[PDB]
UniProtKB/Swiss-Prot annotation, chain A:
Organism from which the protein derives: Severe acute respiratory syndrome coronavirus 2
Residues of the full protein shown: 981 to 1029 of 1273
Protein name, per record: Spike protein S2'
Job description of the protein: Subunit of the fusion protein that is processed upon entry into the host cell. Mediates fusion of the virion and cellular membranes by functioning as a class I viral fusion protein. Contains a viral fusion peptide that is unmasked after S2 cleavage. This cleavage can occur at the cell membrane by host TMPRSS2 or during endocytosis by host CSTL. In either case, this triggers an extensive and irreversible conformational change that leads to fusion of the viral envelope with the cellular cytoplasmic membrane, releasing viral genomic RNA into the host cell cytoplasm.
């Protein structure tokens, strides 16, 4: 924001947003898969109990 | 100043150990070309280096 004027700051911020959003989506997908695995494990534990 | 250097033998100077006030740079619009890349032309007075 300080170094560059809005004209190219817009594209810079867009690139940063795209990268961060991709990272968040990857993290959320990994978390969902892990949560499904843990749900399966918890169901097995509940059945054993 | 009164004289400058040649294009090939461009004179290099080190600026530091002082307070930089670029108010005169844009106050006197006597320069045909005035372009800043990677730094805001107007925010030059609100930066540290």
């Amino acid at each position: 924001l300080s170094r560059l004027d809005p004209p190219e700051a817009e594209v810079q911020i867009d690139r940063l947003i795209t990268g961060r959003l991709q990272s968040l989506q990857t993290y959320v997908t990994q978390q969902l898969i892990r949560a499904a695995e843990i749900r399966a494990s918890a169901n097995l534990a509940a059945t054993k109990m | 100043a009164t004289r400058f250097a040649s294009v090939y033998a461009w004179n290099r100077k080190r600026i530091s150990n002082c307070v930089a006030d670029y108010s005169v740079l844009y106050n006197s619009a006597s320069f045909s070309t005035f372009k800043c890349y990677g730094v805001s032309p107007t925010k030059l007075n609100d930066l540290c280096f």
